[PDB]
């Protein structure tokens, strides 16, 4: 009635599933009681106790023992009678999954040893008193990460006597950045504090000339999160033997973030509508999302790049892998490994918006995970870029990474995973091409300094910005930068169009422009400058094209167009000012209030083309958070969330979100509608459970206006 | 309230079946004048008949397809008939090739072919070769990096006011394939005999059995059969493969191999190794890829069922049909599901017996995968050539997936740091068998290490013949050679792992040699197993040997131990003893699994030195083949009677006996059902075949029933021209 011919044992791919170890493995009475019996086990698992504090696992809102691999911890077993070294033999067993196998690392018998050897599992009797033995158990630093079952087995000559199933002794074993033998070892305490223990983050957005920031709750220590992270791997049917490998954990975990069909954590959406779900802009942290995923057991709607990164960062940090979110400004996504972004122009100099279909994202967020790379030559360990936002790679439409940031900076894109696609996000050239009326194409200009202009991440201790641009690229013009490019071209990166006659403009005319930062609903100026360094007189025709775009760069509508007839004297400089009125863009704005500007100019004399692009985001005023009360763990604190409608219009179905790990579970309030320029208030009583520097996080989302945030640093005390 | 698509300006162009509407007239700006003044296309001629020069010079004349089929990077001829003569002085026009619903010139999906004076190598262009009346003859050359698929063709006349274009015409739809004959193509093969075999041959040989009794059977690739080329494009559309990547042999292999083994409702074949196969066709019954691919096309669902050679057969059809040179390789004693470990464990009881409860991993008698030829511009120089691709899943760095393409060159040298999934393919052919005693107290003791069992022989069909070609030396250096030790070390540096330490197995206290032979037997017959000891040192010993004989699946997975024996041997110094065992038919009959595979463990404990000796061998019982006979004229278009004959070899009744007949270019795959076949009785199947392909052809047969299966037959026939 059917044979299992594919493999002798079904795959062991679920931490949730468990078998039943026999309590009596006898080999015949031939022909007990007088043998050792376990009366109880002590794990010293209190959060104030030495195990959790020495393992840095005391923050988890979990009452079970949680330790980190490759480091010893204490347990104590109580026997029916005193243990006798001569005549007695027992061992502790760690078991994970339904089909444990010692050679697969899922069945781990811990032997009593005299001395703990570094790198191997072992139990050292550190103390014998009465009917008790105090053990110092050390795990392997390559151990599988997950929740293990614990048993104590006494070996008699006729078999094994083992403890029965006890959910109270279930032990979680995580990655250990503190352990020098661990693949994820980070030798700097301040960095471990930030990249592993910090449960609050800062995401940078906006545009390079007006960097905006908002806080995100990672909430890795919150109740249920650790278990949800194991559930993610189980849903991925991730092989238990592979869960101790940070590379494979990063690889499989990141593929689970973006949902394809009914599998995955988040459904991606950039439609500015989001029917039947929550707008990506509404989320305040990962907790909300991961718990919803866990209970519904279905993908959560909806997410965008920073949301994918926030959730993946929670996953990494919760398991013990050092992780941070990075933001790349002017990002070339969906690049197919091409190092060129095309902008097509009409013959007169206008931007041909029919052909110009590729867009540079104002910003794009991805993650970096810290680990060694034993699959690559020496020198590629460290930060590995992993982008859970899909794009076409060699396998299809999927996440990219982990890719060694070291390999990327040097152009060694031949080393897995998906390196050429990450290299192209930060190194592409903007190519300006005239698409003539006869069918031919002429390359006019090359801008090699626009894409990947600034790459940032939150600073260690502090909400500040840390510029990590030089970790990804060498400085423009440097010899090493040209060598890195050449090496990349050798390994699959491509440049379809040859650009030689290009960039050698004999005009010597410099053009540039700036846009003042504006507040939503206000007017603002745009100045275009022209420098003539030659002793020649020129006449120029310039075009201004202004569009309302998504943060991805995708344009919705051109809201303003202008033409300028400039005459430049030899050795002269001149500024022209254009005035953009609130009435021109309002009513057409998309979420994030992003605007894009093209300024192209044709020099009538030399036939040369000058081009420049810039993005702008309109500043939307933040939400106000107020705290009234005492501010002590266990005792009440009143939090008031205040939002003032900035539009001269009625906001409808205004959802406000409150969050703060260790202070409050994520909550949300729904307001029928908000009158033009009127204010609403939300008062909630909070009973914090974590002391020290904490933070309150708020967000606002309506049928129209959204992507509005607020935050407050509070100081809670102990008892 | 809006709608907006903020992720991308244009939806992904990932279906070849989907198409846009190009305007027949497209003007811009003020006018006022006669449009009739400009050229007009009255007709287009592709010279796409099968005897014509386009298909013959492009080596596409074998496809049972009436549309034009050319290969990239090589010129072909077309003729355009206008409404009036072409005036070089005043007319301007170009040919356009378009693919998908969202064509873009910078993505290679919209291709405007310009009229040029001279065709440059590597670029698209059309050269006017003849002017005559209202007609112009062009020599069109495509780029060698061109996307592979079915393009729509249009002719566009340029006027100062815009474009005038022909209308949609399915008759001019042109297929552009990979070109192994073009030097600039990534899949370039520099020799005609290799091209003939690896691209043009539609019949193949699959080697199976076990290393000491290599069995062979024929498989129909049928890449030129009606409907196949279209089904291959359909596979890529089902995979939602971006049209821009279908011109990259690496991505096509990567995505295509992932579609072979169906996970849920996506993919071509549902894998099953249950010996039952209820609600499907047993993997053993298939005679080729045609049957499977067409069923997948019409049902639009995964086909039940397949195993490794079936996946390879089908994937081989896919690659050859598109133009990527490909072959199937068989690895004898394959370490699949290795997780990159270079060690396979066998656990022994304390006495010396095999611990069958702890021994859970198995070596496959054989395992088939594919090799595809292409350059590897994503890797350092020297890694081009054959690339291994295994569509039979196993855990790799991404999950349970196919592995490859991995450069066979990198695998041979241990450079497993190069994508894709290299460590896992390297371990299929390089693992060590580690014999370990699991003592009653809980500890483990490494007794022996056999580094010569796994990947003992790797073969493939020879060029221009049905014999086998030993390619073992392409995957690995000679045992005990310098280069082989360095390869192993390099692999360990990049991810390959050896959990147990085997320096201490210097317990090479092999003064005594042991080995055994199992004679080749026929199903139903008794056979012998001969164990042979050898005392190569001055000494007398008391040995206890154990024999464990099991019925297994071809994958090595055991179903039952059907025979156990102990031997107390005492051999004198410098003397060699021999022991023969007789296995009677009654001991295994009635318990056999499909493929009639048997596995033998022979373990020995030398009482004196406490040493352990161990060896293992597999055996497959031979089954009589199906007899194919033909009587007729043997010329295309004319009838030929084929008779399939099967004689029940079992002295019991075979029930629901399905017989299958196949032969590309001779017959469409067919199958006959037989209620039941009496013990030792014979049945005959007769069929009238009207062949359509001349030259050397082959008839292929297979048999499958409720119990007995994995029975084949074949016959080389010669069809003639007329």
Element (H, E) at A423: helix A419-427
Q: Distance (Å) from the C-alpha of residue A40 to the closest C-alpha of chain B?
A: 23
Please give the Cα distance from A26 to A159 (Å, whole number): 4
For residue A338, give the DSSP letter. B
Query: Which residues in chain B have their C atom more than 2.5 Å from the N of the next written residue, marking a break after them?
Result: 32
Please give the Cα distance from B233 to B14 (Å, whole number): 11
Please give the Cα distance from A476 to A456 (Å, whole number): 18
CATH 2.60.40.1170 fits B625-721, yes or no: no
Q: Distance (Å) from the C-alpha of residue A247 to the closest C-alpha of chain B?
A: 8
Tell me the CA distances in angstroms from A633 to A665, A684, A695, A712, B577, one per residue in order.
15, 16, 14, 17, 83
Residues 6 or more apart whose CB falls under 8 angstroms from that of A87 comprise none
What backbone phi and psi angles, to 5 degrees, belong to A476? -50, 130
Distance of CA B35 to the CA centre of its chain: 56
Do B81 and B41 touch, CB atoms closer than 8 A?
A: yes
Please give the Cα distance from B488 to B661 (Å, whole number): 46
Angle between helices B290-299 and B228-238 (to 10 degrees): 50
Choose from A1, A103, A496 for mutation: most chain B CBs within 10 A: A103
For A239, which of B2, B8, B395 is closest by C-beta distance?
Answer: B395
**Interface list for B 512-571 with A (CB within 8 A):** 553, 555, 557-559
- Is the peptide bond between B686 and the residue preceding it cis, with omega within 30 degrees of 0? no
> What is the fold of B510-624?
Immunoglobulin-like (2.60.40)
Of residues B595, B599, B647, B583, the one with CA closest to residue B284: B595
Please measure the distance between the N-terminal and C-terminal CA atoms of chain A and give it in whole angstroms.
Answer: 65
Beta bridge partners of B137: B79, B130
User: What is B448-490 written as a DSSP string?
Assistant: EEE-SSTT-EEEEEPTTSSSEEE-HHHH-PPTT-HHHHHHHHH
User: What is A655-697 written as a DSSP string?
Assistant: EEEEEETTTEEEEEEEEEEE-TT-EEEEEEEE-----EEEEEE
The three-class DSSP label of residue A488 is helix
Angle between helices B249-260 and B308-322 (to 10 degrees): 150
Paired sense of beta strands B432-438 and B385-396, if any:
unpaired
Do A655 and A700 touch, CB atoms closer than 8 A?
A: yes
Of residues A190, A109, A297, the one with CA closest to residue B442: A109
> What is the fold of B187-509?
Coagulation Factor XIII; Chain A, domain 2 (3.90.260)
> Within 13 Å and on the Cβ side, how many CA atoms surround A452?
25
CATH 2.60.40.10 domain span(s) along chain A: 3-183, 507-621, 622-718
Task: Break chain B down into helix, strand, coil percent, rounded to 5.
Answer: 15, 40, 45
- Residues in chain B closer than 8 A to A342 (CB atoms): 106
Active-site residues of A: which are they?
305, 364, 387
Please give the Cα distance from A328 to A206 (Å, whole number): 11
For residue A198, give the DSSP letter. -
Given an 8 Å threshold on Cβ–Cβ distance, is B5 in contact with A251?
A: no
Helix (H) and strand (E) counts in chain A: 11, 39
Do A627 and A639 touch, CB atoms closer than 8 A?
A: yes
Please give the Cα distance from A289 to A295 (Å, whole number): 10
Given an 8 Å threshold on Cβ–Cβ distance, is B112 in contact with A439?
A: yes
Cα torsion A55, A60, A66, A69: sign: negative
Do B29 and B73 touch, CB atoms closer than 8 A?
A: no
CATH 2.60.40.10 domain span(s) along chain B: 4-186, 510-624, 625-721
Residue ranges of the annotated binding site of A for Ca(2+) are: 427, 429, 476, 481
Residues 6 or more apart whose CB falls under 8 angstroms from that of A589 comprise A520, A548, A618
- The b/e string for A191-208 (b: 16+ C-beta within 10 A; e otherwise) is bbebbbebbbbbbbbbbe
> Within 13 Å and on the Cβ side, how many CA atoms surround B555?
22
- Is the peptide bond between A417 and the residue preceding it cis, with omega within 30 degrees of 0? yes
Do A532 and A568 touch, CB atoms closer than 8 A?
A: yes
Given an 8 Å threshold on Cβ–Cβ distance, is B158 in contact with A554?
A: no
The three-class DSSP label of residue B171 is helix
Please give the Cα distance from B409 to A697 (Å, whole number): 55
Q: Technique behind this structure?
A: X-ray
Distance of CA A569 to the CA centre of its chain: 52
Do A208 and A453 touch, CB atoms closer than 8 A?
A: yes
Element (H, E) at A422: helix A419-427
Paired sense of beta strands B269-271 and B303-306, if any:
parallel
Tell me the CA distances in angstroms from B162 to A675, B29, B104, B153, one per residue in order.
53, 9, 19, 19
Do B512 and B540 touch, CB atoms closer than 8 A?
A: no
CATH 3.90.260.10 domain span(s) along chain A: 184-506
Of residues B98, B259, B262, the one with CA closest to residue B176: B98
> What is the fold of A622-718?
Immunoglobulin-like (2.60.40)
Do B222 and B202 touch, CB atoms closer than 8 A?
A: yes
Please give the Cα distance from B383 to B387 (Å, whole number): 9
Long-range contact set of residues A294-300: C-beta below 8 Å, sequence gap at least 24: A294/A224, A294/A227, A294/A228, A294/A231, A298/A262, A299/A259, A299/A262, A299/A263, A299/A264, A299/A265, A299/A266, A299/A267, A300/A265, A300/A266, A300/A267
Tell me the CA distances in angstroms from B684 to A429, B294, B602, B708, one per residue in order.
71, 27, 44, 18
- Is the peptide bond between A221 and the residue preceding it cis, with omega within 30 degrees of 0? no
Alpha helices, DSSP H, located in B550-633: 585-588
Given an 8 Å threshold on Cβ–Cβ distance, is A394 in contact with B5?
A: no
Tell me the CA distances in angstroms from B411 to A557, B202, B397, B414, B421, one per residue in order.
54, 29, 17, 5, 10
Length of chain A: 719
Among residues B59, B242, B291, B308, the one annotated as catalytic is B308
Nearest CA in chain B to A248: B397
- Residues in chain A closer than 8 A to B550 (CB atoms): none
Please give the Cα distance from B36 to B34 (Å, whole number): 5
Query: For chain B, how long is the longest CA-to-CA vector?
Result: 113
**Interface list for B 330-349 with A (CB within 8 A):** 337, 339, 345
Given an 8 Å threshold on Cβ–Cβ distance, is A414 in contact with B114?
A: no
State in words which class domain A3-183 has.
Answer: mainly beta
What backbone phi and psi angles, to 5 degrees, belong to B204? -140, 170
**Interface list for B 624-653 with A (CB within 8 A):** none
- Residues in chain B closer than 8 A to A415 (CB atoms): 417
The three-class DSSP label of residue B615 is strand
Do B155 and B44 touch, CB atoms closer than 8 A?
A: yes
User: What is A155-170 written as a DSSP string?
Assistant: EETTEEEE----GGG-
Please give the Cα distance from B314 to B148 (Å, whole number): 19
Element (H, E) at B309: helix B308-322
Of residues B705, B713, B640, the one with CA closest to residue B672: B705
Beta bridge partners of B696: B718
Do A266 and A289 touch, CB atoms closer than 8 A?
A: yes
Q: What angle do CA B554, B558, B562 make, to 5 degrees?
A: 115
Given an 8 Å threshold on Cβ–Cβ distance, is A396 in contact with B12?
A: no
Give yes or no for A6 touching B (CB within 8 A). yes
Please give the Cα distance from B77 to B127 (Å, whole number): 10
- CATH number, domain B4-186, options 2.60.40.10, 3.90.1150.10, 2.30.40.10, 3.20.20.60: 2.60.40.10
Residues 6 or more apart whose CB falls under 8 angstroms from that of A103 comprise B345, B361, B499
> Within 13 Å and on the Cβ side, how many CA atoms surround B305?
15
Do B477 and B389 touch, CB atoms closer than 8 A?
A: no
Does the annotation list B132 as a binding residue? no
For residue A718, give the DSSP letter. -
Alpha helices, DSSP H, located in A460-605: 469-472, 479-490, 582-585
Beta bridge partners of A160: A25, A155
Tell me the CA distances in angstroms from B624 to B237, B523, B621, B659, B660, one per residue in order.
43, 9, 10, 15, 16
What backbone phi and psi angles, to 5 degrees, belong to B17? -65, -30
Do B270 and B306 touch, CB atoms closer than 8 A?
A: yes
What backbone phi and psi angles, to 5 degrees, belong to A352? -85, 100
The three-class DSSP label of residue B254 is helix
Please give the Cα distance from A588 to A584 (Å, whole number): 9
CATH code given to domain A507-621: 2.60.40.10
User: What is A243-302 written as a DSSP string?
Assistant: TT-HHHHHHHHHHHHB-BTTBSSEEE--SS--TTS--TTT--BHHHHHHHHHHH-SPEEE
Do B418 and A414 touch, CB atoms closer than 8 A?
A: yes
Give yes or no for B114 touching A (CB within 8 A). yes
For residue B337, give the DSSP letter. S
State in words which class domain A184-506 has.
Answer: alpha beta
Nearest CA in chain B to A238: B399
Of residues B508, B261, B295, the one with CA closest to residue B402: B261
Please give the Cα distance from B708 to B595 (Å, whole number): 9
Q: Does the annotation mark B274 as catalytic?
A: no
Beta bridge partners of B529: B518, B581
For residue B119, give the DSSP letter. P
- Residues in chain B closer than 8 A to A551 (CB atoms): 6
Please give the Cα distance from B511 to B613 (Å, whole number): 11
Alpha helices, DSSP H, located in B40-125: 53-57
Paired sense of beta strands B399-407 and B213-220, if any:
unpaired
Please give the Cα distance from A391 to A421 (Å, whole number): 8
Sheet holding B640-647, edge to edge: B627-632, B640-647, B682-689
What backbone phi and psi angles, to 5 degrees, belong to A85? -50, -35
| Cα R_g (chain A), whole angstroms | 30
Residues 6 or more apart whose CB falls under 8 angstroms from that of A91 comprise A109, A110, A111, A112, A123, A152, A153, A155, B442
Of residues A535, A605, A544, A620, the one with CA closest to residue A576: A544
Sheet holding B578-583, edge to edge: B512-518, B527-535, B578-583
Q: Distance (Å) from the C-alpha of residue A270 to the closest C-alpha of chain B?
A: 5
Query: For chain A, how long is the longest CA-to-CA vector?
Result: 114
Do A68 and A318 touch, CB atoms closer than 8 A?
A: no
Paired sense of beta strands A624-629 and A637-644, if any:
antiparallel
Q: Does the annotation mark B390 as catalytic?
A: yes
For residue B302, give the DSSP letter. P
Please give the Cα distance from B290 to B227 (Å, whole number): 9
Of residues A367, A376, A287, A354, the one with CA closest to residue A328: A367
Distance of CA A370 to the CA centre of its chain: 12
């Amino acid at each position: 009635t059917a044979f299992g011919g594919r493999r002798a044992v079904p795959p062991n791919n679920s931490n949730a599933a468990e078998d039943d170890l026999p309590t009596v493995e006898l080999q015949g009475v031939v022909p007990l009681q007088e043998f050792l019996n376990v009366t109880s086990v002590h794990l010293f698992k209190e959060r104030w106790d030495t195990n959790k504090v020495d393992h840095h696992t005391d923050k988890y809102e979990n009452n079970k023992l949680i330790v980190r691999r490759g480091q010893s911890f204490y347990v104590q077993i109580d026997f029916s009678r005193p243990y006798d070294p001569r005549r007695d033999l027992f061992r502790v067993e760690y078991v994970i999954g339904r089909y444990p196998q010692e050679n697969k690392g899922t069945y781990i018998p811990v032997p009593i040893v005299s001395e703990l050897q570094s790198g191997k599992w072992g139990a050292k009797i550190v103390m014998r008193e009465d009917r008790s033995v105090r053990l110092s158990i050390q795990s392997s630093p390559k151990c599988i990460v997950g929740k293990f079952r614990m048993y104590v087995a006494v070996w008699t000559p006729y078999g094994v006597l083992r403890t029965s199933r006890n959910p109270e002794t279930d032990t979680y074993i995580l990655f250990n950045p503190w352990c020098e033998d661990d693949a994820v070892y980070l030798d700097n305490e301040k960095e471990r504090e930030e990249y592993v223990l910090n449960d609050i983050g800062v995401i940078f957005y906006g545009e390079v000339n007006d960097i905006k920031t908002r806080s995100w709750s990672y909430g890795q220590f919150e109740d249920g999160i650790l278990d949800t992270c194991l559930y993610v791997m189980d849903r991925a049917q991730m092989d238990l033997s592979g869960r101790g490998n940070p590379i494979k954990v990063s690889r499989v975990g990141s593929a689970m973030v973006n949902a394809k069909d009914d599998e995955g954590v988040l459904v991606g959406s950039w439609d500015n509508i989001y029917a039947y779900g929550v707008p990506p802009s509404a989320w305040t942290g990962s907790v909300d999302i991961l718990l919803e995923y866990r209970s519904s057991e279905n993908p959560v709607r909806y997410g965008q790049c920073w949301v994918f990164a926030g959730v993946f960062n929670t996953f990494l940090r919760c398991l013990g892998i050092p992780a941070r979110i990075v933001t790349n400004y002017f990002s070339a996504h969906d690049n197919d490994a091409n190092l060129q972004m095309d902008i097509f122009l009409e013959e007169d100099g206008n931007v041909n918006s029919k052909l110009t279909k590729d867009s540079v994202w104002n910003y794009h967020c991805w993650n970096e995970a810290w680990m060694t790379r034993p699959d690559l030559p020496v020198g590629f360990g460290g930060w590995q870029a992993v982008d859970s936002t899909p794009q076409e790679n060699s396998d299809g439409m999927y996440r990219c990474g982990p890719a060694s940031v070291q390999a990327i900076k040097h152009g060694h894109v031949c080393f897995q995973f998906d390196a050429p696609f990450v290299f192209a996000e930060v190194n592409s050239d903007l190519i300006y091409i005239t698409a003539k009326k006869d069918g031919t194409h002429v390359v006019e200009n090359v801008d090699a300094t626009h894409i990947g202009k600034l790459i940032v991440t939150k600073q260690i201790g502090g909400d500040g910005m840390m510029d990590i641009t030089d970790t990804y690229k060498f400085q423009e013009g440097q010899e090493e930068e040209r060598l890195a490019l050449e090496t990349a071209l050798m390994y699959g990166a491509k440049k379809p169009l040859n650009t030689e006659g290009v960039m050698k403009s004999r005009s010597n005319v410099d053009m540039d422009f700036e846009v003042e930062n504006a507040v939503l609903g206000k007017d603002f100026k745009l100045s275009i400058t022209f420098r003539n360094n030659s002793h020649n007189r020129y006449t120029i025709t310039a075009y201004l094209s202004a569009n309302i775009t998504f943060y991805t760069g995708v344009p919705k509508a051109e809201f303003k167009k202008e033409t300028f007839d400039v005459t430049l004297e030899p050795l002269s400089f001149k500024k022209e000012a254009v005035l953009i009125q609130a009435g021109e863009y309002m009513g057409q704005l998309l979420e994030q209030a992003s605007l894009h500007f093209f300024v192209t100019a044709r020099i009538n004399e030399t036939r040369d083309v000058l081009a420049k692009q810039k993005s702008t985001v309109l500043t939307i005023p933040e939400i106000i958070i107020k705290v009234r009360g005492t501010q002590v763990v266990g005792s009440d604190m009143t939090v008031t969330v205040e939002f003032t409608n900035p539009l001269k219009e009625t906001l409808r179905n205004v959802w406000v979100h409150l969050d703060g790990p260790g202070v409050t579970r994520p909550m949300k309030k729904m307001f029928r509608e908000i009158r033009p320029n009127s204010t609403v208030q939300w008062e909630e009583v909070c009973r914090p459970w974590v002391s020290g520097h904490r933070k309150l996080i708020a967000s606002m989302s309506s049928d129209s206006l959204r992507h509005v945030y607020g935050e407050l640093d509070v100081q809670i005390q102990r008892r």
